[PDB]
């Protein structure tokens, strides 16, 4: 890894220290270099011992005069890449392109070093280990270094613009994958002008991504809107105002499988949520949500609520029976019993309970039949982490459906203890509604605020809570293990004692005392110590830290919610059928434009 890399780098410095030919090369001691060149016995095929050449050394140390003195005796090393392991295709052309020495590049081309020689080393790779990615071919190096005249010379001497890389990259791709410069826009427009012509923008990568989609997923929004400017068509100005239009053809990609919009909204990079603030896509999603999406979402949530209440009243009238046996025991109250399934299905009231139960199970199965094939399309770990997509809301509903499937199987086997999974699935189905709580404006950002907060610092409170109550509950069980439980209560054994302390930490239950009877001496001190250390001390710190956190994320949560609503929009337009979704756009074939949809827009200038 990195340690291996630095070790072999230091070994490279050892080998460059070793030979006096290479050492005088990197020192540029041209008087002694004339002696070495005068030496016939000085072998000139001697390369760097860890996979480099002498011209590579002179290119590193920029000693171009020594390079000229090298090129007569061995010009063939100018055409040679060497055999280092991270540096396997590397030529001195790449270093000369990097160090911007046009006379050196011109001298290398005077020997005729091939530009089409490509360099794909192990260090020459997109990596977190790699600090800089510059592409493979020397055109990519000329582009990212931004030397105009060098890449002009490369055009003059070859260097095809159609360049195919490992990972299918092209010059456009590595221009996108770049820390942004306005100079990069000029370089882009330059090479676009020097393109002759299908069109070169049409090619995707090896992954199958056009540079339009790459710019969309990476959000270099200056480059994005600048690339949009070529497709921008203005129509007419008058007075203060200007009517223009856009070709929304490539921005929809409705005919494609993977749309632009679902590509942009599904990304691990953050800044892409900014790129939706560009004007034509903003107007598009605004028009598109405002015309259809909000009534469909309202009626869908309404039908879900109507399902849930029928499920609830199904859960009310479970068939039950008197308890048959006798308890023979104080501290034992269990007067109820399950019915048998032959015993249950007996009445008209049971008949309507059964048809309600049928409604519940036929609403249970459609959740699976809806969403299970959607999971295989995307990565499931990618699917669950996206809070914008509501992954954690998908976590609850599948467990809900699984448990409501399981409880009927538990019924049909005459198995006891169905009340516990029923109690689970009931509260899970009721807390399921907060996904559909997204759609209102007033209701929207609040739930993703609390969803951020429950992951935020709740564990920080919880772990400390557990250890401090693990102390005090044991202390209380030791200090009450000697006397009458008929008077003290809550501290008979350790498991009721810890739950007593959990009840009484939160102040829900009042502190225990009997003022008729006597009380032991230590418990006053211990309980007062617990009260000062727990009740007011860090509970208030939770309030303060909570307020500071809400104060900080108060800006960002609305920015999140704006992306969340259009994520919901593109999801529902994916899954609904198309006769409910007519084409949004302006069919120019009506107007003789032909098979394209546009969008007209205007304002006055400021």
Partner 1 sequence: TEEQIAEFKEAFSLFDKDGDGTITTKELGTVMRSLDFPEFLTMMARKMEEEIREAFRVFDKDGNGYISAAELRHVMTNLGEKLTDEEVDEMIREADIDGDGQVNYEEFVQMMT
CA distance 510 to 503: 9
What phi and psi, each to the nearest 5 degrees, are found at residue 232? -70, 135
6 forms part of the interface with a copy of itself (CB under 8 A): yes
Please report, as residue ranges, which positions from 129 to 188 form the binding site for partner 1 (by CB under 8 A).
179-183
446 forms part of the interface with a copy of itself (CB under 8 A): yes
Residue with tokens 């029928």: 310
Q: How far is the CB of 35 from a copy of itself (least distance, A)?
A: 25
Please pick, from the candidates 365, 395, 487, 558, the single residue that binds a copy of itself as defined by CB under 8 A. 487
Please report, as residue ranges, which positions from 124 to 153 form the binding site for a copy of itself (by CB under 8 A).
131-132, 145
234 forms part of the interface with a copy of itself (CB under 8 A): no
Please pick, from the candidates 332, 342, 348, 595, the single residue that binds a copy of itself as defined by CB under 8 A. 332
578 forms part of the interface with partner 1 (CB under 8 A): no
Query: Which candidate, 293, 292, 295, 354, places its Cα nearest to that of 319?
Result: 354
Q: How far is the CB of 199 from partner 1 (least distance, A)?
A: 20
CA distance 508 to 291: 49
Q: How far is the CB of 463 from a copy of itself (least distance, A)?
A: 7
Judged by beta carbon distances under 5 to 8 A according to partner kind, the member of partner 1, a copy of itself, none in contact with residue 555 is: partner 1
Judged by beta carbon distances under 5 to 8 A according to partner kind, the member of partner 1, a copy of itself, none in contact with residue 222 is: partner 1
Q: Enumerate the H helices of 19-160 as residue ranges.
A: 20-27, 30-38, 54-60, 64-73, 92-98, 102-111, 138-145, 148-156
Please pick, from the candidates 234, 320, 340, 406, the single residue that binds partner 1 as defined by CB under 8 A. 234
HSE value, Cβ hemisphere, 13 Å, CA-based, for 147 = 22
> Residue 182 or residue 198: which is nearer to partner 1 going by CB?
182
Q: How far is the CB of 143 from a copy of itself (least distance, A)?
A: 14
Residue pair 162/200 in contact by the 8 Å Cβ criterion: yes
Q: How far is the CB of 146 from a copy of itself (least distance, A)?
A: 10
Q: Interacting stretch for a copy of itself, rule CB under 8 A, among 79-87, 214-222, 295-303, 522-530? A: 522-530
The DSSP result for 227-291, as a single string, is HHTTTEEEEEEETTEEEEEEE-HHHH--SSSS-HHHHHHS-S-STHHHHTTSHHHHHHHHHHIII
Judged by beta carbon distances under 5 to 8 A according to partner kind, the member of a copy of itself, partner 1, none in contact with residue 101 is: partner 1
> Residue 126 or residue 460: which is nearer to a copy of itself going by CB?
460
The side-by-side arrangement of strands in the sheet containing 241-247 is: 232-238, 241-247, 598-604
Q: How far is the CB of 479 from a copy of itself (least distance, A)?
A: 6
CA distance 409 to 412: 5
Residue pair 293/569 in contact by the 8 Å Cβ criterion: yes
549 forms part of the interface with partner 1 (CB under 8 A): no
Contacts of range 307-312, beta carbons closer than 8 Å, 24 or more positions apart: 307/359, 307/363, 308/429, 308/430, 308/432, 308/433, 310/356, 310/359, 310/360, 311/360, 311/363, 311/429, 312/426
Residue pair 212/227 in contact by the 8 Å Cβ criterion: yes
Q: Interacting stretch for partner 1, rule CB under 8 A, among 94-102, 324-332, 524-532, 561-569? A: 94-102
Q: How far is the CB of 518 from a copy of itself (least distance, A)?
A: 5
591 forms part of the interface with a copy of itself (CB under 8 A): yes
Q: Does 606 appear as a known binding residue?
A: no
Binding site residues, partner 1, CB under 8 A: 62, 99-102, 179-183, 221-222, 229, 232, 234, 237, 271, 274, 551-552, 555, 606
Q: Which residues are annotated as a binding site for Ca(2+)?
A: 510
């Amino acid at each position: 890894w990195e340690q291996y890399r630095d070790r072999v780098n230091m070994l490279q410095q050892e080998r460059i220290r070793d030979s006096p030919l290479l050492q005088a090369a990197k020192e540029n001691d041209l008087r002694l270099l004339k002696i070495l060149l005068l030496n016939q016995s000085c072998d000139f095929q001697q390369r760097g011992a860890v996979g480099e050449t002498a011209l590579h050394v002179a290119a590193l140390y920029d000693n171009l005069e020594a390079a000229t003195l090298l090129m007569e005796a061995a010009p063939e090393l100018a055409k040679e890449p060497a055999l280092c392991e991270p540096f396997v295709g590397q030529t001195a052309l790449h270093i000369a392109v990097m160090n911007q020495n046009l006379n050196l590049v011109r001298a290398l081309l005077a020997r005729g070093a091939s530009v089409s020689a490509r360099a794909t080393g192990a260090a020459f790779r997109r990596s977190p280990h790699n600090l800089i990615y510059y592409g493979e071919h020397p055109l990519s190096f000329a582009a990212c270094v931004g030397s105009e005249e060098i890449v002009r010379l490369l055009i003059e001497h070859g260097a095809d613009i159609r360049a195919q890389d490992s990972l299918g990259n092209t010059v456009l791709h590595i221009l996108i994958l770049q820390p942004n410069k306005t100079f990069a826009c000029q370089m882009y427009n330059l090479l676009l002008s020097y393109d002759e012509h299908q069109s070169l923008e049409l090619v995707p990568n090896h992954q199958g991504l056009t540079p339009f989609k790459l710019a969309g997923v990476e959000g270099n929004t200056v480059m994005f809107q600048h690339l949009m400017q070529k497709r921008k068509h203005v129509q007419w100005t008058c007075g203060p105002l200007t009517s223009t239009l856009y070709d929304l053809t490539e921005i929809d990609s409705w005919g494609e499988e993977l749309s632009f919009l679902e590509l942009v909204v599904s990304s691990k990079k953050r800044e892409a949520r900014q790129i939706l603030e560009q004007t034509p896509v903003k107007e598009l999603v605004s028009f598109k949500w405002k015309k259809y999406g909000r009534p469909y979402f309202c009626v869908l949530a309404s039908l879900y609520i109507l399902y849930m209440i029928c499920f609830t009243t199904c859960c009310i009238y479970r068939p039950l029976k008197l308890r048959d046996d006798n308890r023979t025991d104080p501290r034992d109250i269990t007067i109820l019993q399950q019915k048998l399934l032959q015993e249950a299905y007996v009445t008209h009231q049971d008949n309507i309970r059964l048809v309600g139960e049928l409604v519940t199970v036929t609403g249970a199965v459609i959740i699976l039949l809806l969403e299970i094939p959607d999971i295989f399309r995307v990565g499931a770990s990618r699917y669950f982490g996206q809070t914008i997509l509501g992954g954690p809301f998908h976590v609850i509903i599948i467990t809900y459906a699984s448990l409501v499937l399981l409880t009927m199987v538990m019924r049909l086997t005459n198995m006891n203890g169905e009340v516990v999974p029923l109690s689970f699935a009931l509260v899970l189905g009721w807390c399921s509604v907060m996904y559909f709580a997204r759609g209102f404006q007033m209701l929207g950002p609040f739930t993703i605020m609390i969803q951020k907060m429950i992951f935020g610092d709740l564990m920080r409170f919880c772990w400390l809570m557990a250890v401090v109550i693990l102390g005090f509950a044991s202390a209380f069980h030791i200090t009450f293990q000697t006397e009458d439980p008929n008077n003290l209560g809550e501290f008979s054994d350790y498991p009721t004692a810890l739950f007593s302390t959990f009840e009484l930490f939160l102040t829900i239950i009042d502190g225990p005392a009997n003022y008729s009877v006597d009380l032991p001496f230590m418990y006053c001190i211990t309980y007062a110590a617990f009260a000062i250390i727990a009740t007011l001390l860090m509970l208030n710190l939770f309030i303060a830290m909570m307020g500071d956190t809400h104060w900080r994320v108060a800006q960002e949560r609305d920015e999140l919610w704006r992306a969340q609503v259009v994520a919901t929009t593109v999801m529902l337009e994916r899954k609904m059928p198309r006769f409910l979704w007519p084409r949004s756009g302006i069919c120019g074939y009506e107007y003789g434009l032909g098979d394209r949809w546009f969008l007209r827009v205007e304002n006055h200038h400021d």
